[PDB]
Amino acid sequence: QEKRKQISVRGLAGVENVTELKKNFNRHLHFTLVKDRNVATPRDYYFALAHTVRDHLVGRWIRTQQHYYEKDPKRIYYLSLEFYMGRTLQNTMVNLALENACDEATYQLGLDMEELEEIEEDAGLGNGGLGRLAACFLDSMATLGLAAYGYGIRYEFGIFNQKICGGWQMEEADDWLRYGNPWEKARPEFTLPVHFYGRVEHTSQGAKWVDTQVVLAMPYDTPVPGYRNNVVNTMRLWSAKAPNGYIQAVLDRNLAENISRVLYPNDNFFEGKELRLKQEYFVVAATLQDIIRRFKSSKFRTNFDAFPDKVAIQLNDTHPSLAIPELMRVLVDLERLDWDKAWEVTVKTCAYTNHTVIPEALERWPVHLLETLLPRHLQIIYEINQRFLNRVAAAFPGDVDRLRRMSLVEEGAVKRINMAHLCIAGSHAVNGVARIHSEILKKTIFKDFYELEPHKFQNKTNGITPRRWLVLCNPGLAEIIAERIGEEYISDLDQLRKLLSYVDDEAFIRDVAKVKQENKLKFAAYLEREYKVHINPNSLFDVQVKRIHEYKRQLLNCLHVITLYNRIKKEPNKFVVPRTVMIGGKAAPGYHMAKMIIKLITAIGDVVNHDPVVGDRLRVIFLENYRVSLAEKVIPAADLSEQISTAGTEASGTGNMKFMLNGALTIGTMDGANVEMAEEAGEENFFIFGMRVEDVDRLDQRGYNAQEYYDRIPELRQIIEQLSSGFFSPKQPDLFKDIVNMLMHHDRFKVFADYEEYVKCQERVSALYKNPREWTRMVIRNIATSGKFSSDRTIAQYAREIWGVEPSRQRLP
Amino acid sequence: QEKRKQISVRGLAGVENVTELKKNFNRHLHFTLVKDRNVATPRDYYFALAHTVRDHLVGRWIRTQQHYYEKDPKRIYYLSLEFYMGRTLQNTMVNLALENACDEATYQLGLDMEELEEIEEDAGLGNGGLGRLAACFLDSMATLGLAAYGYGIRYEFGIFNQKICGGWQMEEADDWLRYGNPWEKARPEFTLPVHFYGRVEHTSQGAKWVDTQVVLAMPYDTPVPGYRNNVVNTMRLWSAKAPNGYIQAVLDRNLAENISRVLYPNDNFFEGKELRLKQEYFVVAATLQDIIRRFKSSKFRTNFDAFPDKVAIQLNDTHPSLAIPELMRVLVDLERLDWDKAWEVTVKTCAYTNHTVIPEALERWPVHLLETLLPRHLQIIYEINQRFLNRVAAAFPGDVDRLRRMSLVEEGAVKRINMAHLCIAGSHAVNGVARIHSEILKKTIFKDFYELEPHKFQNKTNGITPRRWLVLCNPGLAEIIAERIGEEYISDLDQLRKLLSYVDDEAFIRDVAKVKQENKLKFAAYLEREYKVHINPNSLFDVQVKRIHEYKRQLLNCLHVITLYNRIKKEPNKFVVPRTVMIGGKAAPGYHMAKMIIKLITAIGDVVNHDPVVGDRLRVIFLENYRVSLAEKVIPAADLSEQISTAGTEASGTGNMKFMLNGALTIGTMDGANVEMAEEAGEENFFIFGMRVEDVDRLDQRGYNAQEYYDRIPELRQIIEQLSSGFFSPKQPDLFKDIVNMLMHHDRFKVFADYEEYVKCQERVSALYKNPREWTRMVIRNIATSGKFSSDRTIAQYAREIWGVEPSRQRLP
Ligand SMILES: O=C(Nc1ccccc1Oc1ccc(C(=O)O)c(C(=O)O)c1)c1cccc([N+](=O)[O-])c1
Numbered sequence A, B: 001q002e003k004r005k006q007i008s009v010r011g012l013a014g015v016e017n018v019t020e021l022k023k024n025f026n027r028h029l030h031f032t033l034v035k036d037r038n039v040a041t042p043r044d045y046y047f048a049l050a051h052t053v054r055d056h057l058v059g060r061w062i063r064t065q066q067h068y069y070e071k072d073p074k075r076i077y078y079l080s081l082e083f084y085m086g087r088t089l090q091n092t093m094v095n096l097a098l099e100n101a102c103d104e105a106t107y108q109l110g111l112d113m114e115e116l117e118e119i120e121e122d123a124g125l126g127n128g129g130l131g132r133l134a135a136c137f138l139d140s141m142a143t144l145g146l147a148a149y150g151y152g153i154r155y156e157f158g159i160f161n162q163k164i165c166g167g168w169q170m171e172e173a174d175d176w177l178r179y180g181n182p183w184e185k186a187r188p189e190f191t192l193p194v195h196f197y198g199r200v201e202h203t204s205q206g207a208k209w210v211d212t213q214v215v216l217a218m219p220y221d222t223p224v225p226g227y228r229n230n231v232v233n234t235m236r237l238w239s240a241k242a243p244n245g246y247i248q249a250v251l252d253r254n255l256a257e258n259i260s261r262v263l264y265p266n267d268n269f270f271e272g273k274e275l276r277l278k279q280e281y282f283v284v285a286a287t288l289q290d291i292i293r294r295f296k297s298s299k300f301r302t303n304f305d306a307f308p309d310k311v312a313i314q315l316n317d318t319h320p321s322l323a324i325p326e327l328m329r330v331l332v333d334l335e336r337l338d339w340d341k342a343w344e345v346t347v348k349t350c351a352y353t354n355h356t357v358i359p360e361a362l363e364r365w366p367v368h369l370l371e372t373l374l375p376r377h378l379q380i381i382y383e384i385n386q387r388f389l390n391r392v393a394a395a396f397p398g399d400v401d402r403l404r405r406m407s408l409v410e411e412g413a414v415k416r417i418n419m420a421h422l423c424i425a426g427s428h429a430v431n432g433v434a435r436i437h438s439e440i441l442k443k444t445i446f447k448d449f450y451e452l453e454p455h456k457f458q459n460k461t462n463g464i465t466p467r468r469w470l471v472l473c474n475p476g477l478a479e480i481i482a483e484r485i486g487e488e489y490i491s492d493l494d495q496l497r498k499l500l501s502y503v504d505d506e507a508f509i510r511d512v513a514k515v516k517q518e519n520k521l522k523f524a525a526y527l528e529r530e531y532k533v534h535i536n537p538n539s540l541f542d543v544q545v546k547r548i549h550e551y552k553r554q555l556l557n558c559l560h561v562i563t564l565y566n567r568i569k570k571e572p573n574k575f576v577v578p579r580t581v582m583i584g585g586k587a588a589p590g591y592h593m594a595k596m597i598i599k600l601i602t603a604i605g606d607v608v609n610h611d612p613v614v615g616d617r618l619r620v621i622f623l624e625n626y627r628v629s630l631a632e633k634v635i636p637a638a639d640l641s642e643q644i645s646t647a648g649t650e651a652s653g654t655g656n657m658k659f660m661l662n663g664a665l666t667i668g669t670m671d672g673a674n675v676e677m678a679e680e681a682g683e684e685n686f687f688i689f690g691m692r693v694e695d696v697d698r699l700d701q702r703g704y705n706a707q708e709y710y711d712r713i714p715e716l717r718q719i720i721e722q723l724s725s726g727f728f729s730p731k732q733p734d735l736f737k738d739i740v741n742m743l744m745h746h747d748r749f750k751v752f753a754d755y756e757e758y759v760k761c762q763e764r765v766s767a768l769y770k771n772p773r774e775w776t777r778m779v780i781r782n783i784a785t786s787g788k789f790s791s792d793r794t795i796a797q798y799a800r801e802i803w804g805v806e807p808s809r810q811r812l813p
């Protein structure tokens, strides 16, 4: 209780406010859960709490949207296939200032609130950084008093829950709606129809799309509370419904409604399934009909000229890129605008974001698929391309090749549509997600595009919200900072810069260190409790948490790990800094390497965490089912943050930023937004190692020879032999042959090339750790200059340099 | 408003009670529906009302079941595949005395309650009389203060909604849960597992069922309020859930969960699909594990001796007959009781009800199906049979044939299990549902069974509740009766007998007549409004409402109809009593004849309802989507009730009884409970016509020759020619050839044999109608002696002569 109380950033437990809280808990438990104290179980408790919390939202929810209705601002729609939202109870208490009132209320009903929060299922409706970016963005727009709407798909099943079994990942279905969702509000009365397949008939009206199948889109609105300002914005998520012999026909209703069943779990990868394209069409179609409909109930040919003064539609990737030929379909086919105005209108509405440089992320849809599913869409896509490509010609006379490279339409054995090209044609701004990435888009991936229309290209470096990613997750760090500098920082994270005045403050240095060590103890208790894993709490917590992929170089970390181990065994009496190396995250099913890698990590731990010589000097664990909620526990307990992808492959990162905020030192490469984080802090306050991008490119130019490295480095040679011969898998010596083969002969991500610098850099890290005082002063430097990586920042730039709306922190009544 | 007010049986609109009602409406609309008056739509209104109503249930719900928990009575479980429940809002207001308070409240919120009630989706979780019998029974047990539980399956889809198109039935899916159910309460915390397929391994513990698939049963409890006594009992309905490459495996979750998708729509007919057997196993397994579990948390080898003092399990047909070998499975396999005690226990727990004499209703399951799905069940079924059949032997030495006829196991090309035999072996009482039917079970269908164990065989004539089937549906008739004799009748329907004192009371005769004519006007307004059908309100309303089947003889009615028409055209100037002939009800998909019959009825109406000579003398309409809710409208407006099945095929009937209660005269045969209704009223107060059962049998003995009738009756010959030659279908002359063929050559139900007596009897009916005063005095006689056909009666007999519990009308606090 006693910390929770003392914590000023958690609110007031007002005497009548507590009185009302307890009252509404009992009232919900009686009328909602239909219970008494003798038969409620914890989970009814949770729901009693979560209904009462939500009651505090309602009136603000109604009036905020009433407000948009009356004033009619320009509206921002944020189209994504993913809102990596997490749990919502705390989040909402936080943004409503209710957490110490509800904390006091439930204590006084003889219930620990934190215990009840863990009952909540994450809304895991995303894969990794972009989907979570989307969730951070929702929050920041609310906090900025924007008339923003998030639009997506209500999945049955989010990202699978991960089980490690015999060292392997096992996918289980994430049935997150089993027990109900007290947060959502069904909106039956706003249901729309979505048309699949059919054909196109040209007549004297123009074109007409006929014989279609119909799936209904049913919307479920969810409140996005802003930070303490009495804004509550909406996430609108669509669910598939069948239209309105006998038995087999009812059973088959499944087939149309499987549209919303399940998030595809492929992160940083295009698998080109028609089920996925259907998901993407459904979201787009439904959203844009909602959006037109609004527009037609607001002010007032008068109408569509001004459609872009009134609507902004932000593309979270190419996933909702069909939004472009869809708006053209409506405008053109339904609304009867001439193609050229409708195109002025589209390009002025829509804007695109890139999250990936890697080629195998690109959405390239075979035309036959698009011709069958969405025959009209493909026609409009070809008239898009022709006219775009007549614009490339008129600007680059005779550059045939450029024609071919710019085209929306890719040639081959299977003709495909390059959805990123579609997005470039059809948008008024195209952005990347950190300065380095956005430069590379201009210099490489979309170089010819930049030459055409250089004014389209922008940067918007990512952020994370400091509500979720400090105030919720790390109330100790939040509190000690409010103690010095007050509370404004929470929605003005640049004020953190003020903590630089404390670098030499012995109380502050003591407190910081105290709070991390407190987080380390909790995290440790969680591991013992939930998963009966015993960790050393007086070790350096070395954390790499992120989805599993070759670009991210979990493997290079595993290299390091087997080095520490091998060094130790050489020189057993030598002192070394104690470490807990935590690697965590999911593999996309069917990503073989990634699944290999998960097995290798736990294989390491099998050796390493049973050596008696090692003792408690070194421990390797794999962290299970990394998710949003788990990130809120492990990140506040981390000393070191791993950000080790090759230079040029991590567009930005945001877990980088979460570690930063919460008092973790970073080892990383100058990649993504690691580069801007070292800029903010001074490079002398980070662990940057290895190849810069230019050095990667130089390597590519002559050739990557991993054998060169193997022959030159006896320590690396030792591990490779360890792996081949079967040290990590005695009962199956050959188990890791496809790891080694790939390291040896087909490593696109240059692992061994950054080996020697990574190991030496990790020397540096542990040298610094042996001086507590000096570690904690560098950490202060870190935390004091993470304010640039708030999502308020990022969002205020999108508003001002894309949406053409001004932010705001003025409280609604 | 003004009738609703005056109506004493609807309660008090108390000043603070109205004040609280309005308050809780606004409160629900704000916190639940998240609305204001500017954007709620009617349907949010409904839900605001239905949440506030339900709040009045909760505390009674909790304490009633608390009461069972504390006192521990013997508990009655009522196992059915069907609860033909209907809508619930009004029903609950009624039984809670809240209808004139909520009526006043919503008027004063500027909303008509009746208008909001029509927003509610029927819970159509049944096919016709048995499923509805089940719903009437639930109510009566609550009203009698029994510790009764209804147990069934929560279907996704109830009985299809019926659309007539071009005169045909079109099945649409009944997506009754689209918008949510404010009535149910999910009970996640009572989920059970159900095991399909597998195998049986005999070891030293005995038998063990292994390699099974697991479907989870999730229970949804619903409150059954008793009439004004502060009992609220539970219906517990199970829903199928999947257990806890990647994508196709999540999608396939469907397959196990399709167990609860949909009510099979076959009424009075065995189609032997494995999907249906799975439904039946799921319900049984889940229910009985719930039931054992209770039993193990209540009092206290001690335990299972007394299992029958503590449990009664009533079989609504053979549909949950697997309850017998299931209890044996648990007891035997799980609980380790020796087979003989476990059999003492089973027979003492379980009791069976028959609803059908027809052969093609019987559940006869092929053994291979039962061997694959439910291999252990089949073993226990064969040890059941052997020992039963060793009992038949020891009682009937040398009667081989009897062995063979009694056996559970049927021989043939496909071996089958006779589930009714199973039920007879494994039950302590077997009942029929009206005196004639129960005699026939003894004299025919289960004659050898009766000889063995004559003390098993019983009668329990059906009833209907007078809440739904008078007070709700017919508040005018309810009120004029309370005016004379007070209100006790509502839960003591025998008091109706007191209205015989008014047979010669000119005010009463005037009132009765007034209320029917008021019901006729409403019904008429409903038809114009909802379906734009114009009926003559000064006609005799002649109503045949019931599922469509050959036994029920919709066809014999159609015969009559084309007679009236043909008579008229002969003699156009002749006076005839004006009639509106309403035929209504569903066909099971794939019942061809029944679908033919629906087309024939509307074909009749096409001719008949456009003849100018006919004018408003005669109108034929087919009533669409007959359902529970529709029955509550048309029955109070009916003058004549059609109950015309051959003698011996309608086991009982209950729609007979609903018409009776509400002031309809009956034409029928002496069949089912028509016979006991004529007994109660005096036959001189009914229209009984045609073959008695003995005369059917005599016909069978020599042979039914429909040609005999055709040659002898020029009027019948005229219609048959009309039908063949294409009068009823000019654009498709041959359309009704399969009707005629069947009438002519293969009529199992003897239509033409009851023709001449039916027509003459209908003469009688219209003679009586030309004397209003005399019609209304006979009706009084009818209504005054329908009290035997209350379900309180029926239920109090089950309690006393089967369950071995005493009813009660003592109010809970
Ligand atoms: O009623 C709400 N707000 C009100 C109140 C009065 C008029 C307009 C309101 O909100 C609205 C209503 C309609 C629209 C629309 O999409 O056409 C808009 C809009 O976004 O421009 C805002 C409301 C706000 C938030 C949640 C719910 N809800 O769950 O139903 C309802």
Ligand SMILES: O=C(Nc1ccccc1Oc1ccc(C(=O)O)c(C(=O)O)c1)c1cccc([N+](=O)[O-])c1
Pocket (backbone or CB within 6 Å): A033, A034, A035, A036, A038, A039, B061, B062, B063, B065, B066, B067, B068, B069, B185, B221, B293, B294, B297
């Ligand atoms: O809590 C309820 N009643 C109470 C209160 C205290 C103890 C026992 C209660 O009800 C119960 C609880 C458990 C059981 C059981 O099945 O084991 C029984 C029983 O049927 O013998 C009655 C209750 C009654 C009706 C609805 C709900 N509900 O929806 O959860 C809850």
